[PDB]
Amino acid sequence: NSQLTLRALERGDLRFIHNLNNNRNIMSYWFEEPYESFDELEELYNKHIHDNAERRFVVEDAQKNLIGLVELIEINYIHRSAEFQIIIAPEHQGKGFARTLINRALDYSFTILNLHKIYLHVAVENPKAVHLYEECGFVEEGHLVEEFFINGRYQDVKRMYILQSKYLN
Amino acid sequence: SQLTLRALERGDLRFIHNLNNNRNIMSYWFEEPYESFDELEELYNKHIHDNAERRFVVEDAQKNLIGLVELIEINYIHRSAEFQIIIAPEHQGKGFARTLINRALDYSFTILNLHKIYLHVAVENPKAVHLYEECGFVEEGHLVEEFFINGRYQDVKRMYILQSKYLN
Amino acid sequence: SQLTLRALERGDLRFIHNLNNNRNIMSYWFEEPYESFDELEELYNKHIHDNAERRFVVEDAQKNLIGLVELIEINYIHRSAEFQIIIAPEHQGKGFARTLINRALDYSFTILNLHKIYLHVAVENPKAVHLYEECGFVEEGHLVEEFFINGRYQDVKRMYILQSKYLN
Amino acid sequence: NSQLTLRALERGDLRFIHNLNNNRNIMSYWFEEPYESFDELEELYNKHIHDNAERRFVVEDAQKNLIGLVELIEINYIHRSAEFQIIIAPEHQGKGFARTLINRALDYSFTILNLHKIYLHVAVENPKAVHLYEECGFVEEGHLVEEFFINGRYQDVKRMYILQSKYLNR
Amino acid sequence: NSQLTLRALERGDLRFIHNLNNNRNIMSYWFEEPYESFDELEELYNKHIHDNAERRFVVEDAQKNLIGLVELIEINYIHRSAEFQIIIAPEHQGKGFARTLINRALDYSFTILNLHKIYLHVAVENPKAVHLYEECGFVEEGHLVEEFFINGRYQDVKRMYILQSKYLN
Amino acid sequence: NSQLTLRALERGDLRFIHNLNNNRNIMSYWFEEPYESFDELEELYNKHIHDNAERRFVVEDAQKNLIGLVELIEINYIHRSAEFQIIIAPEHQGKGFARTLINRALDYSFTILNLHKIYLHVAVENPKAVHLYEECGFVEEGHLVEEFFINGRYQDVKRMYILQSKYLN
Amino acid sequence: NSQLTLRALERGDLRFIHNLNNNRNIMSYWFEEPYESFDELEELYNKHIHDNAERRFVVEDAQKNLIGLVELIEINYIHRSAEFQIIIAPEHQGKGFARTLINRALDYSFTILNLHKIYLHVAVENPKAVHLYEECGFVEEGHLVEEFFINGRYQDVKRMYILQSKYLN
Amino acid sequence: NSQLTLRALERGDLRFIHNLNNNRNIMSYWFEEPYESFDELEELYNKHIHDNAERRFVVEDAQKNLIGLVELIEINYIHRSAEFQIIIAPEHQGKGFARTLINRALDYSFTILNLHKIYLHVAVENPKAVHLYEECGFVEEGHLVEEFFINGRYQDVKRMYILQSKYLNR
Amino acid sequence: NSQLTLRALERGDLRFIHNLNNNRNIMSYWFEEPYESFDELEELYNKHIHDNAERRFVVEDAQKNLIGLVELIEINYIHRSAEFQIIIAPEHQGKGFARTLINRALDYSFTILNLHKIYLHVAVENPKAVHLYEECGFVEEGHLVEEFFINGRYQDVKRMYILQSKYLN
Amino acid sequence: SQLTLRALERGDLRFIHNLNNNRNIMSYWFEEPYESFDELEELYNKHIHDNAERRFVVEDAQKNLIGLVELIEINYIHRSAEFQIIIAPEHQGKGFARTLINRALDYSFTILNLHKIYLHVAVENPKAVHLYEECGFVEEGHLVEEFFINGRYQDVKRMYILQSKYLN
Amino acid sequence: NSQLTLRALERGDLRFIHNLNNNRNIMSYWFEEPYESFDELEELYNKHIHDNAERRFVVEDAQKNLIGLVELIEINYIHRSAEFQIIIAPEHQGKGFARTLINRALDYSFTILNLHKIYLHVAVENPKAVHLYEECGFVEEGHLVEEFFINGRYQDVKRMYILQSKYLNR
Amino acid sequence: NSQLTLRALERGDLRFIHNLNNNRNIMSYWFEEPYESFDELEELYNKHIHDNAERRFVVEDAQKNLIGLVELIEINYIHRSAEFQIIIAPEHQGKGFARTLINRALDYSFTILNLHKIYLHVAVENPKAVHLYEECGFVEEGHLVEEFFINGRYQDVKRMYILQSKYLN
């Protein structure tokens, strides 16, 4: 709903993020191996406290339930571009929060970091997310062929993208 | 009258963090409303001896955390300092702005021995530029599209006040 | 069916230490049954980012610590990995061997994208070499007097299984 | 020709590399700023000596004249994919060398590194980069809109790729 | 002239820099104290070698003579702004290289660094400096009152500024 | 010949090593990538100067020419085993120095290092290598199936091994 | 009274010292800015644990109430001289403990460190302290003109002093 | 004369500084021990490169002959006051240079550093130090009793001062 | 009894080991000074966590009572030799556990580290231990004359020894 | 008889600190009665392995902290050591001096194998120089104005005793 | 003869020491591996500069020709005992030097170090090591069975000793 | 003579120091072992460069020849005492430079270092040393019995001492 907010990740939030980072199936559409020790994650978090090339956001409702995660990575201040990554948690999915949350990472990228472009990557075989993004104003700019090994085979992905004005206006 | 002003300590940091992740308060500082505690704590721990800033916490007599005030970029040759100010939204509209701005000019001019104090303020903050004008500040600057805030390029004033006019 | 497989954490380490100081279990790994927690903890803390190994903990649904499984010497050119396995003596003879070996080949072949998996197994372990044979492994090696264990020089098998045959 | 070879980027080759990373003409198509200290080149070079995620190639002829460079970067060892890029030094361009150099690299990635997918990012306003790349076998899979700011203004670039599949049989 | 080119500052140049930072005529016009040991200068360098908020340029002619120093400082990245500062060696002044070297500077920022605003601070009693900024398109936006104490007295400086739009177009 | 002697690897030799580790003909037969900067090589050295699980030998003739490299690696200490590897410089191949240099190697391990087992891995399609190990007393014990990807293709290698007993006696 | 003692400062004592270091008015006659974070103080304390150039003493009664602070700083073992600094706390002042406490810092400087001279600095505009010191045997040796910025203006101070014998005898 | 200039103390000037810090004649009035390693001079020099609390001046003539030094120390930026001291090398004393050197320093402190008060500590048994200092405008504000042990015995020193007030108008 | 086990020393075990390291009389037949701070010991323990040249074992019964300590030191993997050291605690002595425990350090040295020789050192004036060792298969190989200062005078000691087969067979 | 002597540990340090800030006890050691715990703790942590000193704590059977005894400047060539001793004022005049001095000479001569033990004692300590004389020590030194203590320059004795005379 | 002297092992003497620690003939009786980097020799040398537990002696003649070495190791300062060993460089063996060298060492240990017991470990298959050692006064106290693996096979060594007692009176 | 001057010890002098500390004739008379590597010497130096409890003097003649070494050690600061030690190079002995170099030494301590007591320790069987201290005003105050083991035997030394008063006056 409108109650949904975003907030900078925090050390208190690191069990909730670990639990999602070890879920084979949540992690399956992020193209990332489900194996992170709470030691490795914790330490990767600390090493990156001051890395200005990312914003990692924890997603919350009103009753203070952690809904999921929005991430901006690969922020380049020269070309003004960033990669966006969203995970809604197992217990918070199929509830209709996607549109909202995706739209606050643009709101953020665009109304705060003054970015020129946000781009994502999405499995053609997760053809629910691609309609979600479309319906937010993202257009397809590449059919990456056999990019990422997911689940026993090489799987294709769509690079999608929305520009700053487009969102802002 | 009941409003004291004292240095920033450690069990002050969850006050600061809170306000530091608020859009409607940070924008007025132009800053980005993203700072985790780790960042906050660690950046605190690195300036602990930096003699170029005075970070103050505003308290009442009941000792409840009223706001903060900063004297940043203190340059000891030209004796210039900037002044930013924040009242927590929960102590706004109480008539605390004038008192807290004068203690800040009272610390700068009567303790630090400074020559200039300067602030930057959003132009769209029309009931605020007055405040500082009303405290003896005068615009010297119309900054065209200094800060990108809330979707667009925006203008802020550079205002200024000297020891010569606050002490005299 | 009820057996999950997940990365090695910190409040896992008294499980590991225990088994790591057991003769009748370590010998089957050829290793020495001497490792204190300090050694264990500190060596853990030094490979935390080593991307050449995947150390997994076996749990049930009741979440009781069933065993561990390791993918060590992962070489990303030849895509070969070794596979060691341990079930705590208190979950032995329950019929857990096949399930846990297949999840290990399922992690190696379908997540890591590996070409080879290889294990070493005592020759005197005659109801075990079968197990892996029975899981699609085939001896390529009779290692003459590789490991000194339990008083004498002893032989182990080098067995192997490819992504080509586990996926097909 | 056949004289051209690739080898490990060494410490002594950094006054060669600095000079090309400070050239506006070369860099502005590599999409990176034409600015970098020898000190930023060498210290960044020292930080990455052990990084199994890249191979950095100084290209030489038969008389050891420094011709050009070749990177293979972002070397992921799950998906087995990398990014491939190439400069040929202003003094050795337009001599029919690019293909040998693309080939050698794809030979290295595929017959040695064992990668599944070599991909390159190429600008539309560089029509002979696109072309040479097609000749060598690369396929476009993308057209990225105003993805990089380059010389006054936002420009599109293409993505093009070959698989181990395609290169080891032709 | 067309022989003036900008290149990154280098260690082997840091003696030339040293001579301009310990000269009072030039550093007055930089609001900064003309005292800086070769060790401070060089330790400061090493300290800011990876620092993305500045670009420090040496200026060469055709014969590899050393001309001057262009700097872009406080490259802010949200707001896309830098402050521009310059020194033309004493021996090399009043040959009309200024405009071409303020030109090169506006070029970098706006064509490569994709910044919106270039801004400087120019001493009101250094009007030569004032009149070189105005022909390159700078506009006054602040009259900073008693900003710097210099040669025994507190002076005024002008903020002047030029925007990306106005440059290219 | 009797002029071939082993001595510890030295820093001043590490250029000679450098030339064999960046050569593809020789490193194929070492199951290892022919790419290694002088900095990796030399930083790796310093890293393993006190490390008791390897002995790294340079091989000299009478005239102090540099011949080759003998290594003993993974000197395990419970089980008394090492793996033996070798390279004879290209210029120095096929003069029949091999046996004497595999000989010296078996000598060290078994007479000074009191190891029980010497073992190697030899590329099946590098049979010259195979036939040099068998005359020095090595016995095959493994046919490692598709162990190394090399020149575009996954190959087989032989484990071969020789025991302390069989050497001395 | 005679019950008053002195004891080396200690980490347990650091809230009591902080509370005095942030009192504009206690700190006003010490010429020192009232702004020390409990972090800065704590850290300055640690950095100086072994600095033999100071003695920092906490002042206590019988019931274990912390009365104030006596400090010796700038101890020079060549000329034998030190600066003395006393603060009695807000809740312990106007009680007649000054004479006593001042006399145990001499007792200490003189009977223990074997110092030759103790000197202080005192605002002419805190003309209660100057009579206190006089009445302890301190004589005036300079009228420092406009030394220290206190409270909106430059204020004068008396350098005072008592020699070793003078005290000891 | 007018040829004399002050500049930043550099690494190369420390064999000049060592030699004066090891001279009993010079130091014994500066109140400091005539003993210090080059190693103690250079390592202490390295520790203080960034210290905004001091300015250390090598004085030179027109031919860059090393004449003397000048410190301004204890540079407090609330009270805006400092201590000022000066040696003139044994080979360039008694040539009428001291005033230029005091002036230059007071020019630096007042027209650049922006200090409110420059103070010096001078010995009674140095009557031409007291004198030169008066000529330049300094006022005694103190007479410190046996404040320093110097050559066998305890000696008094005076304190003398000028304000920015007095120097910028005369 | 047969219930007796050995286990790698551990940080929890360090009061029990300290208490024995400060017993003049237990430490008297170990030729070692009874003075180790729990700080020195603790720190010596940490420094040696990964030193492969020793095994320090804590001895336990069934009810989890710490019986004493067995130590292997000076393990040399080239000659295969080690020094063995046993202490049974004050409250666990004269109970008949010696034979057992000595025989598990051989069992360990011989069945696990694959050592060739274990040797000890024993005061001729502790002529109970020498019969204990004899009765375990240790033979005397030197009468060290006036080796170790124990209790006011230079005392002689027997170097004793048992070989691997001898034990194993 | 009931008095044991053992090494200095960590939960010993508030004993030591206490005595270390006492004038009437430290003076007899000539030392300065100023040492904070931080100094004490940290200097402890730096000599933990220094094999030139043995710092002992005196306990009774009831295990109450009776005093301390030190063997400092142990030189392993000349085999000389100094010996300082302190009984807490609350265990003084109990007749503990002789027993505790002999255990110290018993540790030095029969464990450390030392040749000399030497102590320095205030001359104005006339019922103490006797004590050590009475334990076999003999003045070799009248140190003129060694130590400044309690307002004035003062003399101390250098006394000495050898392994040759304590063992024989 | 009387020209021979011992002195502190210095940094410059390590290319002399390396060469003897890499000789199979010399080392194989010292019971240590004939293998060690200059880097392992120098870094181990750097780690032990302050170690009061050893004295390491380069032996020289009258013309400073490097003759041989001498260690005294495991220098315990309770029991006052040490291990003593000695090499004489292949080019200066069989010239009647060993005794002087053993003597000098026992002079150092007993008249300077003040040790109670100097002990050496000697191999049976070195009958003139045993012999020379007896001549100098050393007594066997042990015969250690197959204590070291040396040249293909396990060998026994003897232990031999002299006390300060015996050496300071003969 | 009047050409003998003291100056601080310097790194470039530390070879001269090296030659006196490895000479047995001279170090016997210093109660210290004539063995000290150039690395120990030079690492010890660096360690005590800021250390205020010693002054280490080299002694030069007019021609910059290197004469000897004067040291002041254990400069205690409460009690104002140092120990004085000296070496006159062998080549430079018995020319009557001693008194002037013991003189210079007493001069420093008492006129610059404001110490009350100079003390030394002189080997009873080194009476030449004894008779040089007595004419410079030293007085015996201790006969240290069997203090140092030297050339095979434990000797006696004299404490001798001289006071500030007696020097100047």
mmCIF file of C-alpha atoms in Angstrom, chain L residues 15-106:
data_model
loop_
_atom_site.group_PDB
_atom_site.id
_atom_site.type_symbol
_atom_site.label_atom_id
_atom_site.label_comp_id
_atom_site.label_asym_id
_atom_site.label_seq_id
_atom_site.Cartn_x
_atom_site.Cartn_y
_atom_site.Cartn_z
ATOM 1 C CA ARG L 15 80.518 1.621 12.598
ATOM 2 C CA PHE L 16 83.038 3.177 14.989
ATOM 3 C CA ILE L 17 80.766 2.253 17.832
ATOM 4 C CA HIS L 18 80.498 -1.282 16.397
ATOM 5 C CA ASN L 19 84.282 -1.802 16.588
ATOM 6 C CA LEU L 20 84.473 -0.887 20.333
ATOM 7 C CA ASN L 21 81.448 -3.070 21.381
ATOM 8 C CA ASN L 22 82.989 -6.266 19.650
ATOM 9 C CA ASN L 23 86.437 -5.704 21.217
ATOM 10 C CA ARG L 24 87.035 -7.754 24.464
ATOM 11 C CA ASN L 25 89.721 -5.535 26.032
ATOM 12 C CA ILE L 26 87.435 -2.512 26.171
ATOM 13 C CA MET L 27 84.038 -4.208 26.839
ATOM 14 C CA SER L 28 85.463 -6.084 29.859
ATOM 15 C CA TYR L 29 85.913 -2.678 31.412
ATOM 16 C CA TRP L 30 82.215 -2.081 30.535
ATOM 17 C CA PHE L 31 80.765 -5.163 32.241
ATOM 18 C CA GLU L 32 79.106 -6.097 29.016
ATOM 19 C CA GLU L 33 79.596 -8.808 26.426
ATOM 20 C CA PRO L 34 81.836 -8.085 23.480
ATOM 21 C CA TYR L 35 79.308 -9.387 20.923
ATOM 22 C CA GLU L 36 76.839 -7.073 19.139
ATOM 23 C CA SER L 37 75.836 -7.299 15.411
ATOM 24 C CA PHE L 38 75.666 -4.126 13.324
ATOM 25 C CA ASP L 39 71.928 -4.896 13.197
ATOM 26 C CA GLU L 40 71.442 -5.108 16.937
ATOM 27 C CA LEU L 41 73.475 -1.946 17.456
ATOM 28 C CA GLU L 42 71.614 -0.001 14.719
ATOM 29 C CA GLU L 43 68.161 -1.463 15.607
ATOM 30 C CA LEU L 44 68.841 -0.505 19.263
ATOM 31 C CA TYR L 45 69.694 3.029 18.158
ATOM 32 C CA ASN L 46 66.468 3.577 16.187
ATOM 33 C CA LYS L 47 64.620 2.130 19.236
ATOM 34 C CA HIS L 48 66.032 4.849 21.613
ATOM 35 C CA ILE L 49 66.093 7.982 19.374
ATOM 36 C CA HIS L 50 63.383 9.764 21.337
ATOM 37 C CA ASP L 51 64.381 8.266 24.641
ATOM 38 C CA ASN L 52 65.098 11.067 27.167
ATOM 39 C CA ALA L 53 66.904 8.807 29.734
ATOM 40 C CA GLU L 54 70.163 8.734 27.763
ATOM 41 C CA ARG L 55 72.615 11.064 26.021
ATOM 42 C CA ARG L 56 75.096 9.343 23.759
ATOM 43 C CA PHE L 57 78.145 11.282 22.823
ATOM 44 C CA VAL L 58 80.851 10.768 20.215
ATOM 45 C CA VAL L 59 84.130 12.515 20.918
ATOM 46 C CA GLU L 60 86.013 14.373 18.115
ATOM 47 C CA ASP L 61 89.465 16.062 18.016
ATOM 48 C CA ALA L 62 90.261 19.126 15.796
ATOM 49 C CA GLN L 63 90.939 17.042 12.616
ATOM 50 C CA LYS L 64 87.527 15.206 12.848
ATOM 51 C CA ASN L 65 89.253 12.065 13.971
ATOM 52 C CA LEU L 66 87.017 9.833 16.084
ATOM 53 C CA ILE L 67 88.299 9.593 19.651
ATOM 54 C CA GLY L 68 85.877 7.822 21.904
ATOM 55 C CA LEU L 69 82.449 7.549 23.388
ATOM 56 C CA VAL L 70 80.902 9.304 26.368
ATOM 57 C CA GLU L 71 77.472 8.148 27.543
ATOM 58 C CA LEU L 72 74.981 9.344 30.148
ATOM 59 C CA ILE L 73 72.558 6.579 30.970
ATOM 60 C CA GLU L 74 69.536 6.065 33.266
ATOM 61 C CA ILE L 75 69.130 9.828 33.388
ATOM 62 C CA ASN L 76 66.610 9.601 36.209
ATOM 63 C CA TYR L 77 64.486 12.799 36.473
ATOM 64 C CA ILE L 78 62.953 12.902 39.943
ATOM 65 C CA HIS L 79 66.260 12.176 41.654
ATOM 66 C CA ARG L 80 68.358 14.013 39.067
ATOM 67 C CA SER L 81 70.972 11.203 38.554
ATOM 68 C CA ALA L 82 72.838 9.600 35.656
ATOM 69 C CA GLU L 83 75.516 6.980 35.326
ATOM 70 C CA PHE L 84 78.612 8.055 33.446
ATOM 71 C CA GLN L 85 80.573 5.672 31.178
ATOM 72 C CA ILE L 86 83.390 6.141 28.704
ATOM 73 C CA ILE L 87 85.647 4.517 26.206
ATOM 74 C CA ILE L 88 88.777 6.098 24.666
ATOM 75 C CA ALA L 89 89.753 4.319 21.463
ATOM 76 C CA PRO L 90 92.815 1.964 21.883
ATOM 77 C CA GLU L 91 94.868 3.922 19.324
ATOM 78 C CA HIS L 92 93.915 7.056 21.282
ATOM 79 C CA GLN L 93 94.689 5.939 24.842
ATOM 80 C CA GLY L 94 97.293 7.228 27.212
ATOM 81 C CA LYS L 95 97.694 10.644 25.593
ATOM 82 C CA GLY L 96 96.040 12.275 28.585
ATOM 83 C CA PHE L 97 92.637 13.020 26.934
ATOM 84 C CA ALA L 98 90.769 11.243 29.779
ATOM 85 C CA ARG L 99 90.383 14.024 32.287
ATOM 86 C CA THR L 100 89.247 16.500 29.628
ATOM 87 C CA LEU L 101 86.655 13.916 28.465
ATOM 88 C CA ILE L 102 85.468 13.091 31.978
ATOM 89 C CA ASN L 103 85.495 16.876 32.459
ATOM 90 C CA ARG L 104 83.300 17.581 29.440
ATOM 91 C CA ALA L 105 80.956 14.985 30.803
ATOM 92 C CA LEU L 106 80.576 16.418 34.247
#
